[PDB]
mmCIF file of N, CA and C in Angstrom:
data_model
loop_
_atom_site.group_PDB
_atom_site.id
_atom_site.type_symbol
_atom_site.label_atom_id
_atom_site.label_comp_id
_atom_site.label_asym_id
_atom_site.label_seq_id
_atom_site.Cartn_x
_atom_site.Cartn_y
_atom_site.Cartn_z
ATOM 1 N N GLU A 1 119.421 122.117 114.680
ATOM 2 C CA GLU A 1 118.293 121.294 115.105
ATOM 3 C C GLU A 1 116.970 121.919 114.682
ATOM 4 N N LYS A 2 116.864 123.246 114.786
ATOM 5 C CA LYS A 2 115.645 123.920 114.350
ATOM 6 C C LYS A 2 115.373 123.654 112.871
ATOM 7 N N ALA A 3 116.412 123.770 112.041
ATOM 8 C CA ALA A 3 116.238 123.521 110.614
ATOM 9 C C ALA A 3 115.794 122.083 110.350
ATOM 10 N N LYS A 4 116.378 121.124 111.070
ATOM 11 C CA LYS A 4 115.990 119.730 110.865
ATOM 12 C C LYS A 4 114.521 119.502 111.211
ATOM 13 N N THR A 5 114.055 120.099 112.308
ATOM 14 C CA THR A 5 112.641 119.973 112.654
ATOM 15 C C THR A 5 111.758 120.526 111.542
ATOM 16 N N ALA A 6 112.149 121.673 110.977
ATOM 17 C CA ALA A 6 111.372 122.232 109.872
ATOM 18 C C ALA A 6 111.296 121.256 108.701
ATOM 19 N N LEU A 7 112.420 120.619 108.368
ATOM 20 C CA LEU A 7 112.416 119.668 107.259
ATOM 21 C C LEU A 7 111.448 118.521 107.518
ATOM 22 N N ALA A 8 111.467 117.977 108.736
ATOM 23 C CA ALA A 8 110.556 116.877 109.045
ATOM 24 C C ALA A 8 109.103 117.303 108.866
ATOM 25 N N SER A 9 108.754 118.489 109.366
ATOM 26 C CA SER A 9 107.375 118.948 109.240
ATOM 27 C C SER A 9 106.962 119.065 107.777
ATOM 28 N N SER A 10 107.846 119.612 106.937
ATOM 29 C CA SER A 10 107.512 119.755 105.521
ATOM 30 C C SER A 10 107.273 118.396 104.871
ATOM 31 N N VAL A 11 108.120 117.417 105.191
ATOM 32 C CA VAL A 11 107.940 116.082 104.625
ATOM 33 C C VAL A 11 106.565 115.534 104.994
ATOM 34 N N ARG A 12 106.177 115.692 106.259
ATOM 35 C CA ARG A 12 104.885 115.163 106.691
ATOM 36 C C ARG A 12 103.730 115.824 105.945
ATOM 37 N N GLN A 13 103.792 117.145 105.764
ATOM 38 C CA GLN A 13 102.697 117.820 105.066
ATOM 39 C C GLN A 13 102.573 117.339 103.622
ATOM 40 N N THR A 14 103.708 117.151 102.945
ATOM 41 C CA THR A 14 103.645 116.643 101.578
ATOM 42 C C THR A 14 102.989 115.263 101.537
ATOM 43 N N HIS A 15 103.362 114.392 102.476
ATOM 44 C CA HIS A 15 102.736 113.074 102.538
ATOM 45 C C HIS A 15 101.223 113.195 102.706
ATOM 46 N N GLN A 16 100.784 114.145 103.532
ATOM 47 C CA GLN A 16 99.352 114.337 103.734
ATOM 48 C C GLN A 16 98.651 114.695 102.427
ATOM 49 N N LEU A 17 99.252 115.583 101.634
ATOM 50 C CA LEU A 17 98.631 115.925 100.349
ATOM 51 C C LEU A 17 98.513 114.692 99.455
ATOM 52 N N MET A 18 99.578 113.892 99.400
ATOM 53 C CA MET A 18 99.529 112.694 98.568
ATOM 54 C C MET A 18 98.388 111.770 98.991
ATOM 55 N N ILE A 19 98.101 111.698 100.292
ATOM 56 C CA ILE A 19 96.981 110.867 100.746
ATOM 57 C C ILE A 19 95.637 111.487 100.350
ATOM 58 N N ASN A 20 95.528 112.812 100.449
ATOM 59 C CA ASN A 20 94.289 113.469 100.040
ATOM 60 C C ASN A 20 93.931 113.113 98.605
ATOM 61 N N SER A 21 94.947 112.914 97.764
ATOM 62 C CA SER A 21 94.674 112.467 96.397
ATOM 63 C C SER A 21 93.848 111.177 96.390
ATOM 64 N N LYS A 22 94.250 110.191 97.196
ATOM 65 C CA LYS A 22 93.518 108.928 97.250
ATOM 66 C C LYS A 22 92.092 109.143 97.731
ATOM 67 N N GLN A 23 91.920 110.009 98.730
ATOM 68 C CA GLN A 23 90.565 110.309 99.197
ATOM 69 C C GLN A 23 89.684 110.791 98.042
ATOM 70 N N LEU A 24 90.201 111.726 97.247
ATOM 71 C CA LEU A 24 89.412 112.235 96.128
ATOM 72 C C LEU A 24 89.123 111.143 95.103
ATOM 73 N N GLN A 25 90.062 110.218 94.902
ATOM 74 C CA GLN A 25 89.788 109.098 94.004
ATOM 75 C C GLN A 25 88.597 108.279 94.495
ATOM 76 N N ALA A 26 88.535 108.020 95.801
ATOM 77 C CA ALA A 26 87.399 107.274 96.339
ATOM 78 C C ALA A 26 86.091 108.014 96.088
ATOM 79 N N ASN A 27 86.113 109.338 96.257
ATOM 80 C CA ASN A 27 84.907 110.113 95.975
ATOM 81 C C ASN A 27 84.483 109.950 94.516
ATOM 82 N N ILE A 28 85.454 109.968 93.601
ATOM 83 C CA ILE A 28 85.137 109.732 92.197
ATOM 84 C C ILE A 28 84.453 108.385 92.031
ATOM 85 N N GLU A 29 84.949 107.365 92.730
ATOM 86 C CA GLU A 29 84.373 106.032 92.572
ATOM 87 C C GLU A 29 82.907 106.010 92.994
ATOM 88 N N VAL A 30 82.586 106.637 94.126
ATOM 89 C CA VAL A 30 81.189 106.637 94.565
ATOM 90 C C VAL A 30 80.308 107.367 93.555
ATOM 91 N N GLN A 31 80.774 108.512 93.048
ATOM 92 C CA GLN A 31 79.964 109.233 92.071
ATOM 93 C C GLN A 31 79.755 108.398 90.811
ATOM 94 N N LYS A 32 80.784 107.660 90.397
ATOM 95 C CA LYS A 32 80.655 106.811 89.218
ATOM 96 C C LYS A 32 79.611 105.727 89.440
ATOM 97 N N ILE A 33 79.581 105.142 90.639
ATOM 98 C CA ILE A 33 78.563 104.134 90.931
ATOM 99 C C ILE A 33 77.171 104.740 90.818
ATOM 100 N N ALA A 34 76.989 105.940 91.368
ATOM 101 C CA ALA A 34 75.685 106.590 91.279
ATOM 102 C C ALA A 34 75.272 106.786 89.826
ATOM 103 N N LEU A 35 76.202 107.265 88.996
ATOM 104 C CA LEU A 35 75.890 107.458 87.583
ATOM 105 C C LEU A 35 75.522 106.144 86.913
ATOM 106 N N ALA A 36 76.258 105.078 87.218
ATOM 107 C CA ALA A 36 75.977 103.798 86.582
ATOM 108 C C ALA A 36 74.571 103.324 86.917
ATOM 109 N N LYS A 37 74.163 103.471 88.178
ATOM 110 C CA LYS A 37 72.805 103.083 88.547
ATOM 111 C C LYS A 37 71.777 103.918 87.793
ATOM 112 N N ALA A 38 71.956 105.241 87.790
ATOM 113 C CA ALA A 38 70.986 106.098 87.116
ATOM 114 C C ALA A 38 70.906 105.785 85.629
ATOM 115 N N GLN A 39 72.009 105.331 85.034
ATOM 116 C CA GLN A 39 71.986 104.952 83.625
ATOM 117 C C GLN A 39 71.270 103.624 83.425
ATOM 118 N N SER A 40 71.483 102.668 84.332
ATOM 119 C CA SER A 40 70.817 101.377 84.210
ATOM 120 C C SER A 40 69.306 101.528 84.307
ATOM 121 N N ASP A 41 68.832 102.395 85.206
ATOM 122 C CA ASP A 41 67.388 102.560 85.365
ATOM 123 C C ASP A 41 66.737 103.067 84.081
ATOM 124 N N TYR A 42 67.394 103.992 83.380
ATOM 125 C CA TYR A 42 66.787 104.605 82.201
ATOM 126 C C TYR A 42 66.617 103.608 81.063
ATOM 127 N N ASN A 43 67.604 102.737 80.849
ATOM 128 C CA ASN A 43 67.545 101.811 79.726
ATOM 129 C C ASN A 43 66.442 100.772 79.871
ATOM 130 N N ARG A 44 65.833 100.665 81.061
ATOM 131 C CA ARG A 44 64.680 99.758 81.305
ATOM 132 C C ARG A 44 63.402 100.443 80.825
ATOM 133 N N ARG A 45 63.385 101.776 80.727
ATOM 134 C CA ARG A 45 62.178 102.527 80.426
ATOM 135 C C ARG A 45 61.959 102.732 78.936
ATOM 136 N N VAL A 46 63.018 102.677 78.125
ATOM 137 C CA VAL A 46 62.869 102.938 76.695
ATOM 138 C C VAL A 46 61.991 101.893 76.017
ATOM 139 N N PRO A 47 62.198 100.588 76.218
ATOM 140 C CA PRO A 47 61.322 99.615 75.546
ATOM 141 C C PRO A 47 59.853 99.805 75.873
ATOM 142 N N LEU A 48 59.572 100.171 77.128
ATOM 143 C CA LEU A 48 58.181 100.412 77.592
ATOM 144 C C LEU A 48 57.668 101.613 76.801
ATOM 145 N N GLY A 49 58.474 102.677 76.690
ATOM 146 C CA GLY A 49 58.065 103.896 76.017
ATOM 147 C C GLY A 49 57.763 103.668 74.550
ATOM 148 N N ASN A 50 58.534 102.793 73.904
ATOM 149 C CA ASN A 50 58.334 102.554 72.478
ATOM 150 C C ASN A 50 56.923 102.052 72.200
ATOM 151 N N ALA B 1 65.512 81.780 92.706
ATOM 152 C CA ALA B 1 64.234 81.114 92.505
ATOM 153 C C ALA B 1 63.252 81.955 91.698
ATOM 154 N N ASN B 2 63.678 83.116 91.204
ATOM 155 C CA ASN B 2 62.828 83.963 90.370
ATOM 156 C C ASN B 2 61.556 84.377 91.110
ATOM 157 N N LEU B 3 61.733 85.135 92.210
ATOM 158 C CA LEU B 3 60.616 85.597 93.082
ATOM 159 C C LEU B 3 60.505 87.124 93.057
ATOM 160 N N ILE B 4 61.620 87.847 93.239
ATOM 161 C CA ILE B 4 61.641 89.340 93.329
ATOM 162 C C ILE B 4 62.165 89.924 92.011
ATOM 163 N N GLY B 5 61.833 91.183 91.686
ATOM 164 C CA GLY B 5 62.280 91.828 90.470
ATOM 165 C C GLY B 5 63.787 91.978 90.420
ATOM 166 N N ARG B 6 64.302 92.097 89.196
ATOM 167 C CA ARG B 6 65.742 92.235 89.013
ATOM 168 C C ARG B 6 66.245 93.613 89.409
ATOM 169 N N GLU B 7 65.404 94.646 89.370
ATOM 170 C CA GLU B 7 65.830 96.042 89.648
ATOM 171 C C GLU B 7 66.047 96.156 91.154
ATOM 172 N N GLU B 8 65.410 95.305 91.949
ATOM 173 C CA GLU B 8 65.582 95.291 93.425
ATOM 174 C C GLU B 8 66.968 94.741 93.761
ATOM 175 N N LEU B 9 67.402 93.659 93.102
ATOM 176 C CA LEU B 9 68.733 93.100 93.310
ATOM 177 C C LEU B 9 69.806 94.046 92.788
ATOM 178 N N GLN B 10 69.556 94.668 91.636
ATOM 179 C CA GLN B 10 70.506 95.635 91.108
ATOM 180 C C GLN B 10 70.755 96.743 92.122
ATOM 181 N N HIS B 11 69.667 97.238 92.725
ATOM 182 C CA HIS B 11 69.727 98.349 93.708
ATOM 183 C C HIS B 11 70.426 97.885 94.987
ATOM 184 N N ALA B 12 70.335 96.601 95.348
ATOM 185 C CA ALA B 12 71.045 96.072 96.510
ATOM 186 C C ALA B 12 72.550 96.023 96.254
ATOM 187 N N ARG B 13 72.948 95.503 95.092
ATOM 188 C CA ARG B 13 74.370 95.459 94.766
ATOM 189 C C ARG B 13 74.956 96.863 94.682
ATOM 190 N N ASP B 14 74.225 97.790 94.059
ATOM 191 C CA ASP B 14 74.708 99.163 93.972
ATOM 192 C C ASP B 14 74.897 99.763 95.358
ATOM 193 N N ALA B 15 73.971 99.480 96.276
ATOM 194 C CA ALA B 15 74.095 99.997 97.630
ATOM 195 C C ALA B 15 75.339 99.451 98.311
ATOM 196 N N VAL B 16 75.604 98.157 98.144
ATOM 197 C CA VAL B 16 76.791 97.573 98.765
ATOM 198 C C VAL B 16 78.055 98.225 98.217
ATOM 199 N N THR B 17 78.121 98.406 96.897
ATOM 200 C CA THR B 17 79.306 99.025 96.309
ATOM 201 C C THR B 17 79.486 100.457 96.799
ATOM 202 N N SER B 18 78.392 101.217 96.890
ATOM 203 C CA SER B 18 78.493 102.588 97.376
ATOM 204 C C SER B 18 78.970 102.625 98.821
ATOM 205 N N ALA B 19 78.474 101.708 99.653
ATOM 206 C CA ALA B 19 78.920 101.663 101.040
ATOM 207 C C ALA B 19 80.407 101.352 101.123
ATOM 208 N N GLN B 20 80.887 100.444 100.272
ATOM 209 C CA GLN B 20 82.317 100.158 100.249
ATOM 210 C C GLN B 20 83.115 101.403 99.882
ATOM 211 N N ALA B 21 82.651 102.146 98.875
ATOM 212 C CA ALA B 21 83.344 103.371 98.491
ATOM 213 C C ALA B 21 83.399 104.360 99.650
ATOM 214 N N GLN B 22 82.284 104.524 100.361
ATOM 215 C CA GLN B 22 82.258 105.469 101.473
ATOM 216 C C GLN B 22 83.216 105.043 102.580
ATOM 217 N N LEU B 23 83.275 103.744 102.870
ATOM 218 C CA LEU B 23 84.224 103.275 103.874
ATOM 219 C C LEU B 23 85.657 103.549 103.438
ATOM 220 N N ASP B 24 85.945 103.393 102.146
ATOM 221 C CA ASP B 24 87.274 103.742 101.656
ATOM 222 C C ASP B 24 87.568 105.219 101.889
ATOM 223 N N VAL B 25 86.582 106.080 101.636
ATOM 224 C CA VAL B 25 86.772 107.511 101.868
ATOM 225 C C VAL B 25 87.117 107.764 103.330
ATOM 226 N N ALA B 26 86.386 107.122 104.240
ATOM 227 C CA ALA B 26 86.643 107.326 105.664
ATOM 228 C C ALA B 26 88.036 106.843 106.049
ATOM 229 N N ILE B 27 88.426 105.665 105.564
ATOM 230 C CA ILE B 27 89.750 105.144 105.884
ATOM 231 C C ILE B 27 90.821 106.109 105.403
ATOM 232 N N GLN B 28 90.654 106.650 104.196
ATOM 233 C CA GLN B 28 91.638 107.596 103.686
ATOM 234 C C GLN B 28 91.674 108.865 104.524
ATOM 235 N N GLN B 29 90.509 109.388 104.915
ATOM 236 C CA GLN B 29 90.497 110.548 105.801
ATOM 237 C C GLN B 29 91.290 110.267 107.068
ATOM 238 N N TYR B 30 91.218 109.035 107.568
ATOM 239 C CA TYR B 30 91.987 108.689 108.761
ATOM 240 C C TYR B 30 93.481 108.604 108.458
ATOM 241 N N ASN B 31 93.847 108.017 107.317
ATOM 242 C CA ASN B 31 95.262 107.842 107.000
ATOM 243 C C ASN B 31 95.972 109.186 106.909
ATOM 244 N N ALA B 32 95.350 110.164 106.262
ATOM 245 C CA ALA B 32 95.768 111.542 106.446
ATOM 246 C C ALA B 32 95.380 111.993 107.848
ATOM 247 N N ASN B 33 96.220 112.831 108.442
ATOM 248 C CA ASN B 33 96.179 113.212 109.848
ATOM 249 C C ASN B 33 96.815 112.134 110.714
ATOM 250 N N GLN B 34 97.144 110.974 110.155
ATOM 251 C CA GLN B 34 98.043 110.032 110.801
ATOM 252 C C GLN B 34 99.479 110.221 110.344
ATOM 253 N N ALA B 35 99.695 110.959 109.254
ATOM 254 C CA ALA B 35 101.046 111.317 108.849
ATOM 255 C C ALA B 35 101.641 112.369 109.773
ATOM 256 N N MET B 36 100.798 113.195 110.391
ATOM 257 C CA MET B 36 101.280 114.202 111.326
ATOM 258 C C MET B 36 101.669 113.591 112.665
ATOM 259 N N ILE B 37 101.036 112.483 113.042
ATOM 260 C CA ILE B 37 101.184 111.912 114.375
ATOM 261 C C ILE B 37 102.031 110.651 114.278
ATOM 262 N N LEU B 38 102.920 110.602 113.287
ATOM 263 C CA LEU B 38 103.762 109.424 113.109
ATOM 264 C C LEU B 38 104.580 109.143 114.363
ATOM 265 N N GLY B 39 105.260 110.160 114.886
ATOM 266 C CA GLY B 39 106.066 109.960 116.080
ATOM 267 C C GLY B 39 105.222 109.475 117.243
ATOM 268 N N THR B 40 105.708 108.426 117.908
ATOM 269 C CA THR B 40 104.926 107.792 118.963
ATOM 270 C C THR B 40 104.713 108.724 120.151
ATOM 271 N N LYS B 41 105.751 109.441 120.570
ATOM 272 C CA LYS B 41 105.739 110.179 121.826
ATOM 273 C C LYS B 41 105.471 111.659 121.584
ATOM 274 N N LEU B 42 104.688 112.257 122.486
ATOM 275 C CA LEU B 42 104.330 113.666 122.355
ATOM 276 C C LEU B 42 105.555 114.564 122.455
ATOM 277 N N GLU B 43 106.519 114.192 123.298
ATOM 278 C CA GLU B 43 107.675 115.053 123.516
ATOM 279 C C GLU B 43 108.628 115.042 122.326
ATOM 280 N N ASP B 44 108.490 114.076 121.424
ATOM 281 C CA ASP B 44 109.392 113.939 120.289
ATOM 282 C C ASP B 44 108.828 114.538 119.004
ATOM 283 N N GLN B 45 107.651 115.153 119.057
ATOM 284 C CA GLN B 45 107.025 115.648 117.845
ATOM 285 C C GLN B 45 107.764 116.879 117.317
ATOM 286 N N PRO B 46 107.811 117.058 115.986
ATOM 287 C CA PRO B 46 108.595 118.164 115.418
ATOM 288 C C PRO B 46 108.205 119.535 115.944
ATOM 289 N N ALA B 47 106.906 119.766 116.140
ATOM 290 C CA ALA B 47 106.456 121.084 116.578
ATOM 291 C C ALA B 47 106.980 121.420 117.968
ATOM 292 N N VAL B 48 106.961 120.451 118.883
ATOM 293 C CA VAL B 48 107.347 120.726 120.265
ATOM 294 C C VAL B 48 108.841 121.021 120.355
ATOM 295 N N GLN B 49 109.646 120.299 119.573
ATOM 296 C CA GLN B 49 111.090 120.477 119.646
ATOM 297 C C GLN B 49 111.515 121.860 119.169
ATOM 298 N N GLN B 50 110.818 122.411 118.174
ATOM 299 C CA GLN B 50 111.123 123.760 117.719
ATOM 300 C C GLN B 50 111.067 124.756 118.871
ATOM 301 N N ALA C 1 113.229 123.297 102.566
ATOM 302 C CA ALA C 1 113.711 122.900 103.883
ATOM 303 C C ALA C 1 115.140 122.378 103.809
ATOM 304 N N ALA C 2 115.463 121.627 102.755
ATOM 305 C CA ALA C 2 116.824 121.134 102.593
ATOM 306 C C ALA C 2 117.807 122.282 102.424
ATOM 307 N N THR C 3 117.415 123.319 101.685
ATOM 308 C CA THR C 3 118.279 124.488 101.552
ATOM 309 C C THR C 3 118.554 125.114 102.914
ATOM 310 N N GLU C 4 117.498 125.246 103.725
ATOM 311 C CA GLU C 4 117.605 125.844 105.080
ATOM 312 C C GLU C 4 118.518 124.979 105.954
ATOM 313 N N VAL C 5 118.456 123.649 105.822
ATOM 314 C CA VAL C 5 119.287 122.747 106.614
ATOM 315 C C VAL C 5 120.740 122.826 106.167
ATOM 316 N N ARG C 6 120.971 122.964 104.860
ATOM 317 C CA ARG C 6 122.340 123.091 104.368
ATOM 318 C C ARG C 6 122.984 124.379 104.858
ATOM 319 N N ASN C 7 122.229 125.480 104.862
ATOM 320 C CA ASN C 7 122.780 126.721 105.403
ATOM 321 C C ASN C 7 123.154 126.555 106.870
ATOM 322 N N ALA C 8 122.291 125.902 107.648
ATOM 323 C CA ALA C 8 122.602 125.687 109.059
ATOM 324 C C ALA C 8 123.850 124.829 109.223
ATOM 325 N N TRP C 9 123.974 123.774 108.419
ATOM 326 C CA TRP C 9 125.142 122.905 108.509
ATOM 327 C C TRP C 9 126.418 123.661 108.170
ATOM 328 N N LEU C 10 126.378 124.500 107.135
ATOM 329 C CA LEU C 10 127.550 125.302 106.797
ATOM 330 C C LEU C 10 127.926 126.225 107.947
ATOM 331 N N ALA C 11 126.937 126.917 108.512
ATOM 332 C CA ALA C 11 127.214 127.803 109.635
ATOM 333 C C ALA C 11 127.848 127.040 110.788
ATOM 334 N N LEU C 12 127.383 125.818 111.041
ATOM 335 C CA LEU C 12 127.945 125.035 112.136
ATOM 336 C C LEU C 12 129.366 124.585 111.831
ATOM 337 N N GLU C 13 129.628 124.166 110.593
ATOM 338 C CA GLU C 13 130.947 123.641 110.261
ATOM 339 C C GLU C 13 131.991 124.743 110.186
ATOM 340 N N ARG C 14 131.576 125.977 109.924
ATOM 341 C CA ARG C 14 132.525 127.082 109.881
ATOM 342 C C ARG C 14 132.975 127.531 111.267
ATOM 343 N N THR C 15 132.665 126.770 112.318
ATOM 344 C CA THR C 15 133.161 127.080 113.653
ATOM 345 C C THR C 15 134.607 126.659 113.854
ATOM 346 N N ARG C 16 135.250 126.081 112.842
ATOM 347 C CA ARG C 16 136.682 125.812 112.855
ATOM 348 C C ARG C 16 137.333 126.663 111.770
ATOM 349 N N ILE C 17 138.137 127.639 112.182
ATOM 350 C CA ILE C 17 138.835 128.507 111.240
ATOM 351 C C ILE C 17 139.990 127.739 110.615
ATOM 352 N N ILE C 18 140.142 127.880 109.301
ATOM 353 C CA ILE C 18 141.132 127.137 108.532
ATOM 354 C C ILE C 18 142.062 128.116 107.832
ATOM 355 N N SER C 19 143.337 127.740 107.743
ATOM 356 C CA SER C 19 144.353 128.595 107.146
ATOM 357 C C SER C 19 144.483 128.283 105.664
ATOM 358 N N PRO C 20 144.243 129.244 104.758
ATOM 359 C CA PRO C 20 144.396 129.000 103.319
ATOM 360 C C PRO C 20 145.811 129.251 102.807
ATOM 361 N N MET C 21 146.804 128.697 103.491
ATOM 362 C CA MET C 21 148.177 128.983 103.110
ATOM 363 C C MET C 21 149.119 128.130 103.941
ATOM 364 N N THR C 22 150.254 127.778 103.342
ATOM 365 C CA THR C 22 151.312 127.026 104.008
ATOM 366 C C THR C 22 152.433 128.002 104.350
ATOM 367 N N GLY C 23 152.305 128.659 105.501
ATOM 368 C CA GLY C 23 153.218 129.702 105.906
ATOM 369 C C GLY C 23 153.587 129.596 107.374
ATOM 370 N N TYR C 24 153.901 130.752 107.958
ATOM 371 C CA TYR C 24 154.380 130.852 109.331
ATOM 372 C C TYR C 24 153.582 131.913 110.073
ATOM 373 N N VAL C 25 153.321 131.669 111.354
ATOM 374 C CA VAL C 25 152.433 132.511 112.149
ATOM 375 C C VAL C 25 153.236 133.654 112.750
ATOM 376 N N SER C 26 152.766 134.880 112.536
ATOM 377 C CA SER C 26 153.559 136.067 112.824
ATOM 378 C C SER C 26 152.990 136.925 113.940
ATOM 379 N N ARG C 27 151.795 137.490 113.734
ATOM 380 C CA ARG C 27 151.234 138.506 114.665
ATOM 381 C C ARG C 27 149.954 137.985 115.316
ATOM 382 N N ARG C 28 150.060 136.953 116.152
ATOM 383 C CA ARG C 28 148.899 136.440 116.864
ATOM 384 C C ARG C 28 148.306 137.506 117.775
ATOM 385 N N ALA C 29 146.976 137.603 117.758
ATOM 386 C CA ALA C 29 146.271 138.549 118.611
ATOM 387 C C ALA C 29 144.991 137.965 119.193
ATOM 388 N N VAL C 30 144.776 136.658 119.083
ATOM 389 C CA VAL C 30 143.567 136.007 119.569
ATOM 390 C C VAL C 30 143.925 135.194 120.801
ATOM 391 N N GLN C 31 143.127 135.335 121.852
ATOM 392 C CA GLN C 31 143.333 134.619 123.098
ATOM 393 C C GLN C 31 142.066 133.865 123.464
ATOM 394 N N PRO C 32 142.191 132.709 124.117
ATOM 395 C CA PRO C 32 140.991 131.973 124.522
ATOM 396 C C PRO C 32 140.102 132.815 125.422
ATOM 397 N N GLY C 33 138.796 132.659 125.243
ATOM 398 C CA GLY C 33 137.828 133.490 125.920
ATOM 399 C C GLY C 33 137.480 134.767 125.193
ATOM 400 N N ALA C 34 138.109 135.034 124.052
ATOM 401 C CA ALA C 34 137.865 136.260 123.313
ATOM 402 C C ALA C 34 136.562 136.178 122.529
ATOM 403 N N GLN C 35 135.903 137.323 122.398
ATOM 404 C CA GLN C 35 134.684 137.455 121.610
ATOM 405 C C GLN C 35 135.054 138.079 120.271
ATOM 406 N N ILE C 36 134.864 137.328 119.186
ATOM 407 C CA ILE C 36 135.374 137.719 117.878
ATOM 408 C C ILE C 36 134.221 137.860 116.894
ATOM 409 N N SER C 37 134.492 138.588 115.821
ATOM 410 C CA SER C 37 133.528 138.928 114.788
ATOM 411 C C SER C 37 134.193 138.721 113.437
ATOM 412 N N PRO C 38 133.408 138.630 112.358
ATOM 413 C CA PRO C 38 134.010 138.383 111.037
ATOM 414 C C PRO C 38 134.967 139.460 110.548
ATOM 415 N N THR C 39 135.185 140.517 111.332
ATOM 416 C CA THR C 39 136.134 141.561 110.975
ATOM 417 C C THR C 39 137.356 141.607 111.879
ATOM 418 N N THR C 40 137.385 140.829 112.946
ATOM 419 C CA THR C 40 138.478 140.905 113.904
ATOM 420 C C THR C 40 139.698 140.160 113.371
ATOM 421 N N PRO C 41 140.874 140.787 113.328
ATOM 422 C CA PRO C 41 142.084 140.043 112.954
ATOM 423 C C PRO C 41 142.481 139.076 114.057
ATOM 424 N N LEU C 42 142.775 137.838 113.666
ATOM 425 C CA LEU C 42 143.142 136.792 114.610
ATOM 426 C C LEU C 42 144.644 136.552 114.650
ATOM 427 N N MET C 43 145.275 136.419 113.495
ATOM 428 C CA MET C 43 146.717 136.236 113.389
ATOM 429 C C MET C 43 147.088 136.459 111.928
ATOM 430 N N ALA C 44 148.321 136.115 111.568
ATOM 431 C CA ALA C 44 148.789 136.244 110.200
ATOM 432 C C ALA C 44 149.535 134.987 109.780
ATOM 433 N N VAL C 45 149.559 134.743 108.471
ATOM 434 C CA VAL C 45 150.360 133.683 107.873
ATOM 435 C C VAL C 45 151.173 134.298 106.745
ATOM 436 N N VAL C 46 152.487 134.124 106.801
ATOM 437 C CA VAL C 46 153.407 134.669 105.813
ATOM 438 C C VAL C 46 154.128 133.495 105.160
ATOM 439 N N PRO C 47 153.985 133.273 103.854
ATOM 440 C CA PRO C 47 154.724 132.182 103.218
ATOM 441 C C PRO C 47 156.218 132.449 103.242
ATOM 442 N N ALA C 48 156.983 131.366 103.168
ATOM 443 C CA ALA C 48 158.434 131.446 103.162
ATOM 444 C C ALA C 48 159.017 131.501 101.761
ATOM 445 N N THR C 49 158.181 131.507 100.729
ATOM 446 C CA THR C 49 158.629 131.556 99.349
ATOM 447 C C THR C 49 157.933 132.696 98.619
ATOM 448 N N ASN C 50 158.365 132.927 97.381
ATOM 449 C CA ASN C 50 157.794 133.964 96.527
ATOM 450 C C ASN C 50 157.903 135.338 97.197
#
């Protein structure tokens, strides 16, 4: 029974890591949105500068 | 109706998308740490049985 | 964890001693209530052939 409990705990921890992956993907998405905005703002300034 | 600048609307849409990304991050943070508490009852949790 | 569970299962299943021979029981020395170890002689099996 002790060994079986250990197996269950290990399975749960692995599942937690797999979820953390998705969390990091969401963080990537927010950073990408920020970059896209900062890029859009700059392309409005070049024609004025010319 | 062509009243406000386009960069104001762009910044509104970007804000909405960023907020959605942040909510996704929060939901994922919750989904992890719910893998540990899968078992409904406190007495049945793997740690206690050990 | 699976390796640890398999070792536990083997240890549990080895609680039934099995005879590796088709013979006859000669010098029994094990009695119920006895405390035995992997070195204690329990009985003997002597084949009737060869």
